[PDB]
Amino acid sequence: MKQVCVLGNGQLGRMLRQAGEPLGIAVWPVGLDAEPAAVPFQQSVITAEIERWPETALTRELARHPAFVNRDVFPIIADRLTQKQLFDKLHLPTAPWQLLAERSEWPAVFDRLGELAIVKRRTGGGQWRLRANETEQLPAECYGECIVEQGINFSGEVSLVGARGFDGSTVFYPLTHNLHQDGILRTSVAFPQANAQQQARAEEMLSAIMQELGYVGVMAMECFVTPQGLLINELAPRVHNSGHWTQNGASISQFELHLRAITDLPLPQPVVNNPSVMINLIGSDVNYDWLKLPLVHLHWYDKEVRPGRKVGHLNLTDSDTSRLTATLEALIPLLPPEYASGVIWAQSKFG
Amino acid sequence: MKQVCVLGNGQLGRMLRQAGEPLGIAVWPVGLDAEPAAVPFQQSVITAEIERWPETALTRELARHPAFVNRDVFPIIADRLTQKQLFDKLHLPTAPWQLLAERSEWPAVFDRLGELAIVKRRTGGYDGRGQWRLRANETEQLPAECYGECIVEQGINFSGEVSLVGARGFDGSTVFYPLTHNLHQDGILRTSVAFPQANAQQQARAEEMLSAIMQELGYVGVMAMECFVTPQGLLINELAPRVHNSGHWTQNGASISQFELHLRAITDLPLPQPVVNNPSVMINLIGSDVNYDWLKLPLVHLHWYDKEVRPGRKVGHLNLTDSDTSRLTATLEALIPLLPPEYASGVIWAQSKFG
Ligand SMILES: Nc1ncnc2c1ncn2[C@@H]1O[C@H](COP(=O)(O)OP(=O)(O)O)[C@@H](O)[C@H]1O
Ligand SMILES: Nc1ncnc2c1ncn2[C@@H]1O[C@H](COP(=O)(O)OP(=O)(O)O)[C@@H](O)[C@H]1O
Ligand SMILES: [Mg+2]
Ligand SMILES: [Mg+2]
């Protein structure tokens, strides 16, 4: 048979497993605490839903696996420094960055970057927006452990989701409009036909990247939409949240796409006929009333509900835009008030 | 939580389970062999993927549990006899029939029914199995074991076959999918095609018939009605008190799949009318191995049952759906060569419907 093991017990793994079953592919998602003896790792291909991991007996063994795809790619991506660096080596648009070592760097820093400064964690994610006077508002921890970027005034956020096969073939989904709030992805909108020039450009970028990396499987690229054009923000070496829509909006979902690649399967270009809307469910309980709207696709992760925690998502796709928008509106009252903003935002796209 | 136990380990149970997962509904498909203790039956809604079952300590337990939905409806449907009587009682159009009680009845039988005599087993006949097409000279060709255990219907000459899949909620509400065109070969379903917009009159008449049925039985869940298309109109062939192979296209071709729809019904979840925007085609994979090459075609949706491949056995299906019929048909072509010869007929047939 076809057998895969996924490093990580998360919802992504879950979704990957779900995607594989019908395909005859057996996915065994697995947590770091996992004993080597419980995983059939010795007989499968390995993938991961996580960028980095502790050194356990298992992870240790996976260190010498002739089948841990992209195993060595991770480390570069895992680190925001080397990542940013990667962009630089490729001559790909990105926000002016520096490593934040000394406090003895601040003056210049606020000099290079200007007014506002955005700081993030090199690893494990993680973002502080400081000004010339907030400078001591930050931990000393972040010294040579955090990066520093120019505050970017973008007009929109987009994400590019695609895959590269073992033969270098690549496929892409259309660009996805993303809405973050309090640094969390709240809402996504995907149009069957994105802006040609935008799409092309992004594809160029993502491809340069994946090939330079030698990357195999699905990877996502977060970008900013600027008057000066697109700028790469972040890279995710795995299926990404902003593509969850593909489960019901494309002929091949991302999870599927991933599996295909790593399992040496056909990687044709997925069909996308209609727009989709994804609603992230953050720290809310399941309201089966949502299921009254026929266009709604509930994806419940089955995790303990808790504040700020991603517990599921709602997938909405249809041919009728009216029907599509009416569903959204009807949703408002079925969701806690904090959801209203995103819903509306998405709604605004169909105007 | 939301927990469901399914009497039966088959592909249907599997698909129900898959369908439930993202909904937060745990489904436990149970093998007949299974020890009762081992099933979370006491704290779940019970359902079944089979019409009938042997007397096992397992079935004994389950069948007796007040949680078993439609438990009583089963016996009536499982027996072609009682099922036929039900159509009658409902005054629903169906092939003229009779119970084959005694040999000395043959003469009479041929009197009413005509030339061709289609004999069917009352119980246990899944894929045109225990069924005989006999003539006045062939009667001796039929097992004696059938006397009283089988019925006879008049050979029906139909333009085509269609199945209606729908559901009834605890609250009497009902939903339906568009009529599905079916192609049986060697008494086996090979292919189905659905159109977003079936024949209104035909669609409505079938629906009227399905409801009367479900209502009359107070059925709660997905049920499928097989009909023959004839000159006079539609005739009820068979009923399926459960998710049916002919509905497999709903998995990828409807906003709510028949699996999803069945779990919703039984757990008392909302049951709005599924949204169907395009046509779809389902291809049944019989006794054939998996060909991942099939996946070369972006519109193909593989459904592998993970069973042991055997001749005449249902190992999976291929769903194909799309707004662009040409793409659709061009896909179908592209598959012919990907499938073993026996498949070509179905395909072309399928193809034949878009033209
Ligand atoms: N340099 C920047 N200028 C403006 N906004 C930014 C900048 N960097 C990040 N953001 C904002 O922070 C969000 C999340 O930041 P990021 O660190 O890239 O992702 P994550 O928190 O998901 O790991 C962005 O998607 C955007 O709202
Ligand atoms: N009275 C009849 N006249 C003509 N064809 C019939 C008749 N009864 C059954 N058939 C044929 O046999 C097929 C399968 O038989 P059926 O008993 O209805 O289902 P199954 O054996 O699959 O449970 C039908 O789909 C049809 O092609
Ligand atoms: Mg982000
Ligand atoms: Mg039948």
UniProtKB/Swiss-Prot annotation, chain B:
Organism superkingdom: Bacteria
GO terms under biological process: 'de novo' IMP biosynthetic process
One cellular-component annotation, GO: cytosol
The enzyme's E.C. designation: 6.3.4.18
Catalytic activity reported: 5-amino-1-(5-phospho-beta-D-ribosyl)imidazole + hydrogencarbonate + ATP = 5-carboxyamino-1-(5-phospho-D-ribosyl)imidazole + ADP + phosphate + 2 H(+)
Keyword Ligase assigned: yes
EC category name: ligase
Associated pathway: Purine metabolism; IMP biosynthesis via de novo pathway; 5-amino-1-(5-phospho-D-ribosyl)imidazole-4-carboxylate from 5-amino-1-(5-phospho-D-ribosyl)imidazole (N5-CAIR route): step 1/2
ATP-grasp domain ranges (all copies): 84-267
Alphabetized UniProt keyword annotations: ATP-binding, Ligase, Nucleotide-binding, Purine biosynthesis
Molecular function terms, GO-annotated: 5-(carboxyamino)imidazole ribonucleotide synthase activity; ATP binding; metal ion binding; phosphoribosylaminoimidazole carboxylase activity
Ligase in keyword set: yes
Binding annotation for ATP: 80, 120, 125-131, 153-156, 161, 184, 237-238
Subunit structure and binding partners: Homodimer.
UniProt family annotation: Belongs to the PurK/PurT family.
Function statement: Catalyzes the ATP-dependent conversion of 5-aminoimidazole ribonucleotide (AIR) and HCO(3)(-) to N5-carboxyaminoimidazole ribonucleotide (N5-CAIR).
PANTHER family linked: PHOSPHORIBOSYLAMINOIMIDAZOLE CARBOXYLASE, PURINE BIOSYNTHESIS PROTEIN 6/7, PUR6/7
Protein name per Swiss-Prot or TrEMBL: N5-carboxyaminoimidazole ribonucleotide synthase
Protein species of origin: Escherichia coli (strain K12)
Taxonomic placement: Bacteria, Pseudomonadati, Pseudomonadota, Gammaproteobacteria, Enterobacterales
